[PDB]
Amino acid sequence: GSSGSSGPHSMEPQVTLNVTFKNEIQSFLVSDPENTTWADIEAMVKVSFDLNTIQIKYLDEENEEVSINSQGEYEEALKMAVKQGNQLQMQVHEGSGPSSG
């Protein structure tokens, strides 16, 4: 690789994205939470559960569901995850779409 910026934070970058869709629970490791993009995540979670539109929501440091609709939003969330233990509790929330479902 390359020894540039680098932002492991702690216990490595690999973050545990715990997605909770309704009653379903999943986990997606992100060895590159800083490199990857929310767009990549969104889709992932979507395709992961085969969805056209979703509104993921992760619990912040207030136990309040926070929806990510941008990179910056994800970044922070990723920063917080590190606080927890390299994991983040996300909850999928189907937005709206006929096709599929």
mmCIF file of N, CA and C in Angstrom:
data_model
loop_
_atom_site.group_PDB
_atom_site.id
_atom_site.type_symbol
_atom_site.label_atom_id
_atom_site.label_comp_id
_atom_site.label_asym_id
_atom_site.label_seq_id
_atom_site.Cartn_x
_atom_site.Cartn_y
_atom_site.Cartn_z
ATOM 1 N N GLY A 1 0.824 -1.198 0.000
ATOM 2 C CA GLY A 1 0.000 0.000 0.000
ATOM 3 C C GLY A 1 0.867 1.261 0.000
ATOM 4 N N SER A 2 0.319 2.316 0.586
ATOM 5 C CA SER A 2 1.028 3.582 0.660
ATOM 6 C C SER A 2 0.943 4.147 2.080
ATOM 7 N N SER A 3 2.059 4.703 2.528
ATOM 8 C CA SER A 3 2.123 5.280 3.861
ATOM 9 C C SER A 3 1.859 6.786 3.791
ATOM 10 N N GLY A 4 0.593 7.124 3.598
ATOM 11 C CA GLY A 4 0.196 8.520 3.511
ATOM 12 C C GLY A 4 -0.528 8.964 4.784
ATOM 13 N N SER A 5 -1.675 9.595 4.585
ATOM 14 C CA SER A 5 -2.471 10.073 5.702
ATOM 15 C C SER A 5 -2.625 8.967 6.746
ATOM 16 N N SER A 6 -3.539 8.051 6.463
ATOM 17 C CA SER A 6 -3.793 6.941 7.364
ATOM 18 C C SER A 6 -4.622 7.418 8.560
ATOM 19 N N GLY A 7 -5.675 6.666 8.846
ATOM 20 C CA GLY A 7 -6.553 6.998 9.955
ATOM 21 C C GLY A 7 -7.213 5.742 10.527
ATOM 22 N N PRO A 8 -6.386 4.931 11.240
ATOM 23 C CA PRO A 8 -6.878 3.703 11.840
ATOM 24 C C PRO A 8 -7.716 4.000 13.085
ATOM 25 N N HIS A 9 -7.446 5.152 13.681
ATOM 26 C CA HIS A 9 -8.165 5.565 14.875
ATOM 27 C C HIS A 9 -7.785 4.654 16.043
ATOM 28 N N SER A 10 -8.204 3.401 15.936
ATOM 29 C CA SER A 10 -7.916 2.425 16.972
ATOM 30 C C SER A 10 -8.481 1.059 16.576
ATOM 31 N N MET A 11 -7.807 0.018 17.042
ATOM 32 C CA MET A 11 -8.230 -1.340 16.744
ATOM 33 C C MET A 11 -8.453 -1.530 15.242
ATOM 34 N N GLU A 12 -7.674 -0.791 14.464
ATOM 35 C CA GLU A 12 -7.777 -0.867 13.016
ATOM 36 C C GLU A 12 -9.016 -0.113 12.531
ATOM 37 N N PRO A 13 -9.048 0.139 11.196
ATOM 38 C CA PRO A 13 -10.166 0.848 10.594
ATOM 39 C C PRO A 13 -11.395 -0.056 10.489
ATOM 40 N N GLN A 14 -11.142 -1.307 10.132
ATOM 41 C CA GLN A 14 -12.214 -2.278 9.992
ATOM 42 C C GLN A 14 -13.304 -2.020 11.035
ATOM 43 N N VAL A 15 -14.377 -1.393 10.580
ATOM 44 C CA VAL A 15 -15.492 -1.082 11.459
ATOM 45 C C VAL A 15 -16.616 -2.094 11.229
ATOM 46 N N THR A 16 -17.346 -2.374 12.298
ATOM 47 C CA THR A 16 -18.448 -3.318 12.227
ATOM 48 C C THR A 16 -19.777 -2.575 12.070
ATOM 49 N N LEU A 17 -20.292 -2.601 10.850
ATOM 50 C CA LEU A 17 -21.550 -1.939 10.554
ATOM 51 C C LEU A 17 -22.706 -2.904 10.825
ATOM 52 N N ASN A 18 -23.319 -2.731 11.987
ATOM 53 C CA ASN A 18 -24.435 -3.577 12.377
ATOM 54 C C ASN A 18 -25.737 -2.970 11.850
ATOM 55 N N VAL A 19 -26.219 -3.542 10.757
ATOM 56 C CA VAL A 19 -27.449 -3.070 10.144
ATOM 57 C C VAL A 19 -28.625 -3.898 10.668
ATOM 58 N N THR A 20 -29.642 -3.192 11.138
ATOM 59 C CA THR A 20 -30.827 -3.846 11.668
ATOM 60 C C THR A 20 -32.059 -3.461 10.849
ATOM 61 N N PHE A 21 -32.412 -4.338 9.920
ATOM 62 C CA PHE A 21 -33.564 -4.104 9.068
ATOM 63 C C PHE A 21 -34.823 -4.738 9.659
ATOM 64 N N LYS A 22 -35.659 -3.890 10.239
ATOM 65 C CA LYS A 22 -36.896 -4.354 10.845
ATOM 66 C C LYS A 22 -36.568 -5.275 12.022
ATOM 67 N N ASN A 23 -36.524 -6.566 11.725
ATOM 68 C CA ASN A 23 -36.224 -7.558 12.745
ATOM 69 C C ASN A 23 -34.946 -8.307 12.361
ATOM 70 N N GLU A 24 -34.444 -7.989 11.177
ATOM 71 C CA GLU A 24 -33.233 -8.621 10.683
ATOM 72 C C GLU A 24 -32.000 -7.846 11.154
ATOM 73 N N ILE A 25 -30.923 -8.587 11.372
ATOM 74 C CA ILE A 25 -29.681 -7.985 11.823
ATOM 75 C C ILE A 25 -28.526 -8.504 10.962
ATOM 76 N N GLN A 26 -27.691 -7.574 10.525
ATOM 77 C CA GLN A 26 -26.550 -7.922 9.696
ATOM 78 C C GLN A 26 -25.314 -7.136 10.139
ATOM 79 N N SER A 27 -24.167 -7.565 9.633
ATOM 80 C CA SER A 27 -22.912 -6.913 9.966
ATOM 81 C C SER A 27 -22.018 -6.835 8.726
ATOM 82 N N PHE A 28 -21.500 -5.639 8.485
ATOM 83 C CA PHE A 28 -20.632 -5.417 7.341
ATOM 84 C C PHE A 28 -19.330 -4.735 7.765
ATOM 85 N N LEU A 29 -18.242 -5.480 7.641
ATOM 86 C CA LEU A 29 -16.934 -4.962 8.007
ATOM 87 C C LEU A 29 -16.467 -3.971 6.938
ATOM 88 N N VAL A 30 -15.911 -2.864 7.408
ATOM 89 C CA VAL A 30 -15.421 -1.832 6.508
ATOM 90 C C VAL A 30 -13.944 -1.562 6.806
ATOM 91 N N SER A 31 -13.089 -2.287 6.102
ATOM 92 C CA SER A 31 -11.655 -2.136 6.280
ATOM 93 C C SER A 31 -11.208 -0.761 5.780
ATOM 94 N N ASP A 32 -12.135 -0.073 5.130
ATOM 95 C CA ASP A 32 -11.850 1.248 4.597
ATOM 96 C C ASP A 32 -13.090 2.131 4.747
ATOM 97 N N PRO A 33 -13.372 2.516 6.021
ATOM 98 C CA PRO A 33 -14.521 3.357 6.312
ATOM 99 C C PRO A 33 -14.260 4.805 5.895
ATOM 100 N N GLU A 34 -12.983 5.122 5.739
ATOM 101 C CA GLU A 34 -12.588 6.463 5.345
ATOM 102 C C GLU A 34 -12.416 6.542 3.826
ATOM 103 N N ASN A 35 -11.919 5.451 3.262
ATOM 104 C CA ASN A 35 -11.702 5.384 1.826
ATOM 105 C C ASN A 35 -13.050 5.236 1.118
ATOM 106 N N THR A 36 -13.800 4.230 1.546
ATOM 107 C CA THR A 36 -15.106 3.970 0.964
ATOM 108 C C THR A 36 -16.000 5.205 1.087
ATOM 109 N N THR A 37 -17.117 5.161 0.376
ATOM 110 C CA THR A 37 -18.062 6.265 0.397
ATOM 111 C C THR A 37 -19.425 5.790 0.904
ATOM 112 N N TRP A 38 -20.170 6.729 1.468
ATOM 113 C CA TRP A 38 -21.489 6.421 1.994
ATOM 114 C C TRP A 38 -22.311 5.786 0.871
ATOM 115 N N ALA A 39 -22.144 6.336 -0.324
ATOM 116 C CA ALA A 39 -22.861 5.835 -1.484
ATOM 117 C C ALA A 39 -22.614 4.331 -1.621
ATOM 118 N N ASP A 40 -21.380 3.939 -1.342
ATOM 119 C CA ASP A 40 -21.002 2.538 -1.429
ATOM 120 C C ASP A 40 -21.718 1.752 -0.331
ATOM 121 N N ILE A 41 -21.812 2.376 0.834
ATOM 122 C CA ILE A 41 -22.467 1.749 1.970
ATOM 123 C C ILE A 41 -23.965 1.622 1.683
ATOM 124 N N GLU A 42 -24.591 2.769 1.463
ATOM 125 C CA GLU A 42 -26.016 2.801 1.177
ATOM 126 C C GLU A 42 -26.404 1.624 0.279
ATOM 127 N N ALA A 43 -25.872 1.648 -0.935
ATOM 128 C CA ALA A 43 -26.153 0.594 -1.895
ATOM 129 C C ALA A 43 -25.943 -0.766 -1.229
ATOM 130 N N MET A 44 -24.742 -0.951 -0.700
ATOM 131 C CA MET A 44 -24.401 -2.197 -0.035
ATOM 132 C C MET A 44 -25.550 -2.677 0.853
ATOM 133 N N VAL A 45 -25.911 -1.832 1.807
ATOM 134 C CA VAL A 45 -26.989 -2.156 2.726
ATOM 135 C C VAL A 45 -28.258 -2.461 1.929
ATOM 136 N N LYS A 46 -28.494 -1.641 0.916
ATOM 137 C CA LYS A 46 -29.664 -1.812 0.071
ATOM 138 C C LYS A 46 -29.624 -3.198 -0.575
ATOM 139 N N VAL A 47 -28.688 -3.359 -1.499
ATOM 140 C CA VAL A 47 -28.534 -4.624 -2.196
ATOM 141 C C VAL A 47 -28.438 -5.757 -1.172
ATOM 142 N N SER A 48 -27.744 -5.470 -0.082
ATOM 143 C CA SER A 48 -27.571 -6.451 0.976
ATOM 144 C C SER A 48 -28.926 -7.052 1.358
ATOM 145 N N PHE A 49 -29.932 -6.191 1.386
ATOM 146 C CA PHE A 49 -31.276 -6.623 1.733
ATOM 147 C C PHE A 49 -32.222 -6.483 0.538
ATOM 148 N N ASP A 50 -31.630 -6.201 -0.614
ATOM 149 C CA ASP A 50 -32.405 -6.040 -1.833
ATOM 150 C C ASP A 50 -33.504 -5.000 -1.601
ATOM 151 N N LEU A 51 -33.115 -3.739 -1.718
ATOM 152 C CA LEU A 51 -34.052 -2.646 -1.524
ATOM 153 C C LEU A 51 -33.800 -1.570 -2.581
ATOM 154 N N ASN A 52 -34.867 -0.865 -2.929
ATOM 155 C CA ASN A 52 -34.775 0.190 -3.924
ATOM 156 C C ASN A 52 -34.456 1.514 -3.226
ATOM 157 N N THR A 53 -35.097 1.716 -2.085
ATOM 158 C CA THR A 53 -34.890 2.930 -1.314
ATOM 159 C C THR A 53 -34.904 2.619 0.184
ATOM 160 N N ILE A 54 -33.853 3.063 0.857
ATOM 161 C CA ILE A 54 -33.732 2.840 2.288
ATOM 162 C C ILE A 54 -33.239 4.123 2.959
ATOM 163 N N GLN A 55 -33.408 4.169 4.272
ATOM 164 C CA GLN A 55 -32.987 5.328 5.041
ATOM 165 C C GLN A 55 -32.247 4.886 6.306
ATOM 166 N N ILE A 56 -31.119 4.225 6.092
ATOM 167 C CA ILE A 56 -30.311 3.744 7.200
ATOM 168 C C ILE A 56 -30.320 4.786 8.321
ATOM 169 N N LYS A 57 -30.148 4.297 9.540
ATOM 170 C CA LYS A 57 -30.132 5.171 10.700
ATOM 171 C C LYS A 57 -29.300 4.524 11.810
ATOM 172 N N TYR A 58 -28.254 5.232 12.211
ATOM 173 C CA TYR A 58 -27.374 4.741 13.257
ATOM 174 C C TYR A 58 -27.556 5.544 14.547
ATOM 175 N N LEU A 59 -27.417 4.846 15.665
ATOM 176 C CA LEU A 59 -27.562 5.478 16.965
ATOM 177 C C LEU A 59 -26.268 6.215 17.316
ATOM 178 N N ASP A 60 -26.420 7.491 17.638
ATOM 179 C CA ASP A 60 -25.277 8.314 17.995
ATOM 180 C C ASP A 60 -24.937 8.095 19.470
ATOM 181 N N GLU A 61 -24.299 9.100 20.053
ATOM 182 C CA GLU A 61 -23.912 9.029 21.452
ATOM 183 C C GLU A 61 -25.065 9.489 22.345
ATOM 184 N N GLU A 62 -26.242 9.573 21.741
ATOM 185 C CA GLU A 62 -27.427 9.997 22.467
ATOM 186 C C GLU A 62 -28.529 8.942 22.346
ATOM 187 N N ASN A 63 -28.204 7.872 21.634
ATOM 188 C CA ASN A 63 -29.153 6.790 21.435
ATOM 189 C C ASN A 63 -30.257 7.255 20.485
ATOM 190 N N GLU A 64 -29.914 8.237 19.665
ATOM 191 C CA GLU A 64 -30.863 8.778 18.707
ATOM 192 C C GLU A 64 -30.494 8.339 17.289
ATOM 193 N N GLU A 65 -31.473 7.758 16.610
ATOM 194 C CA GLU A 65 -31.264 7.289 15.251
ATOM 195 C C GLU A 65 -30.822 8.445 14.353
ATOM 196 N N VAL A 66 -29.690 8.243 13.695
ATOM 197 C CA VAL A 66 -29.148 9.255 12.806
ATOM 198 C C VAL A 66 -29.039 8.681 11.392
ATOM 199 N N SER A 67 -29.736 9.328 10.469
ATOM 200 C CA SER A 67 -29.725 8.893 9.082
ATOM 201 C C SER A 67 -28.561 9.550 8.337
ATOM 202 N N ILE A 68 -27.896 8.747 7.519
ATOM 203 C CA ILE A 68 -26.767 9.234 6.747
ATOM 204 C C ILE A 68 -27.208 9.476 5.302
ATOM 205 N N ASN A 69 -27.110 10.731 4.888
ATOM 206 C CA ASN A 69 -27.494 11.106 3.538
ATOM 207 C C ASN A 69 -26.345 11.872 2.880
ATOM 208 N N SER A 70 -25.138 11.572 3.335
ATOM 209 C CA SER A 70 -23.953 12.222 2.802
ATOM 210 C C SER A 70 -22.695 11.560 3.364
ATOM 211 N N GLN A 71 -21.571 11.865 2.732
ATOM 212 C CA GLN A 71 -20.297 11.309 3.157
ATOM 213 C C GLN A 71 -19.939 11.813 4.556
ATOM 214 N N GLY A 72 -19.958 13.130 4.699
ATOM 215 C CA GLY A 72 -19.638 13.750 5.973
ATOM 216 C C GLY A 72 -20.396 13.074 7.117
ATOM 217 N N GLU A 73 -21.671 12.812 6.866
ATOM 218 C CA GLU A 73 -22.514 12.172 7.861
ATOM 219 C C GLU A 73 -21.936 10.810 8.250
ATOM 220 N N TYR A 74 -21.533 10.062 7.234
ATOM 221 C CA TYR A 74 -20.962 8.744 7.455
ATOM 222 C C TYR A 74 -19.637 8.840 8.213
ATOM 223 N N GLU A 75 -18.762 9.695 7.705
ATOM 224 C CA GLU A 75 -17.461 9.890 8.322
ATOM 225 C C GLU A 75 -17.600 9.955 9.844
ATOM 226 N N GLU A 76 -18.303 10.981 10.299
ATOM 227 C CA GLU A 76 -18.518 11.169 11.723
ATOM 228 C C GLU A 76 -18.974 9.860 12.369
ATOM 229 N N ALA A 77 -20.063 9.323 11.839
ATOM 230 C CA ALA A 77 -20.610 8.078 12.351
ATOM 231 C C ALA A 77 -19.483 7.056 12.506
ATOM 232 N N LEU A 78 -18.614 7.024 11.506
ATOM 233 C CA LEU A 78 -17.492 6.102 11.518
ATOM 234 C C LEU A 78 -16.548 6.468 12.665
ATOM 235 N N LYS A 79 -16.411 7.768 12.884
ATOM 236 C CA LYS A 79 -15.546 8.261 13.943
ATOM 237 C C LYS A 79 -16.097 7.812 15.297
ATOM 238 N N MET A 80 -17.415 7.883 15.416
ATOM 239 C CA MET A 80 -18.078 7.489 16.648
ATOM 240 C C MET A 80 -17.945 5.983 16.885
ATOM 241 N N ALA A 81 -18.170 5.228 15.820
ATOM 242 C CA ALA A 81 -18.079 3.779 15.898
ATOM 243 C C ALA A 81 -16.794 3.392 16.634
ATOM 244 N N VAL A 82 -15.719 4.083 16.285
ATOM 245 C CA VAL A 82 -14.430 3.823 16.903
ATOM 246 C C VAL A 82 -14.557 3.967 18.421
ATOM 247 N N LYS A 83 -15.364 4.936 18.825
ATOM 248 C CA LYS A 83 -15.581 5.188 20.240
ATOM 249 C C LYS A 83 -16.175 3.937 20.891
ATOM 250 N N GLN A 84 -17.189 3.393 20.237
ATOM 251 C CA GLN A 84 -17.851 2.200 20.739
ATOM 252 C C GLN A 84 -16.853 1.046 20.845
ATOM 253 N N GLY A 85 -16.409 0.581 19.685
ATOM 254 C CA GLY A 85 -15.456 -0.515 19.634
ATOM 255 C C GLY A 85 -15.250 -0.996 18.196
ATOM 256 N N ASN A 86 -15.167 -0.032 17.291
ATOM 257 C CA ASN A 86 -14.971 -0.340 15.885
ATOM 258 C C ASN A 86 -16.257 -0.944 15.316
ATOM 259 N N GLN A 87 -17.378 -0.467 15.836
ATOM 260 C CA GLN A 87 -18.673 -0.948 15.391
ATOM 261 C C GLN A 87 -19.713 0.171 15.474
ATOM 262 N N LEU A 88 -20.746 0.039 14.656
ATOM 263 C CA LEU A 88 -21.810 1.029 14.627
ATOM 264 C C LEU A 88 -23.156 0.319 14.459
ATOM 265 N N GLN A 89 -24.116 0.743 15.267
ATOM 266 C CA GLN A 89 -25.447 0.159 15.217
ATOM 267 C C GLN A 89 -26.335 0.944 14.249
ATOM 268 N N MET A 90 -26.481 0.394 13.053
ATOM 269 C CA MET A 90 -27.297 1.029 12.032
ATOM 270 C C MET A 90 -28.623 0.287 11.850
ATOM 271 N N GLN A 91 -29.656 1.055 11.537
ATOM 272 C CA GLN A 91 -30.977 0.486 11.334
ATOM 273 C C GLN A 91 -31.525 0.892 9.964
ATOM 274 N N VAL A 92 -31.787 -0.116 9.145
ATOM 275 C CA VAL A 92 -32.312 0.120 7.810
ATOM 276 C C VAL A 92 -33.769 0.574 7.914
ATOM 277 N N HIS A 93 -34.115 1.541 7.077
ATOM 278 C CA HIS A 93 -35.468 2.071 7.065
ATOM 279 C C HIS A 93 -35.913 2.307 5.620
ATOM 280 N N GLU A 94 -36.601 1.313 5.075
ATOM 281 C CA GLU A 94 -37.087 1.400 3.709
ATOM 282 C C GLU A 94 -37.764 2.751 3.471
ATOM 283 N N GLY A 95 -37.255 3.466 2.479
ATOM 284 C CA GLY A 95 -37.799 4.770 2.140
ATOM 285 C C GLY A 95 -39.172 4.636 1.477
ATOM 286 N N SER A 96 -39.145 4.287 0.199
ATOM 287 C CA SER A 96 -40.375 4.122 -0.557
ATOM 288 C C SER A 96 -40.054 3.693 -1.990
ATOM 289 N N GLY A 97 -40.679 2.598 -2.400
ATOM 290 C CA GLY A 97 -40.469 2.075 -3.738
ATOM 291 C C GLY A 97 -41.315 0.821 -3.975
ATOM 292 N N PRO A 98 -42.000 0.804 -5.150
ATOM 293 C CA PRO A 98 -42.844 -0.324 -5.507
ATOM 294 C C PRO A 98 -42.000 -1.524 -5.942
ATOM 295 N N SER A 99 -41.293 -1.340 -7.046
ATOM 296 C CA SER A 99 -40.445 -2.395 -7.576
ATOM 297 C C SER A 99 -39.724 -3.111 -6.432
ATOM 298 N N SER A 100 -39.796 -4.434 -6.466
ATOM 299 C CA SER A 100 -39.157 -5.244 -5.444
ATOM 300 C C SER A 100 -39.798 -4.968 -4.082
ATOM 301 N N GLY A 101 -39.680 -5.949 -3.199
ATOM 302 C CA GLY A 101 -40.242 -5.825 -1.865
ATOM 303 C C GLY A 101 -41.308 -6.894 -1.616
#
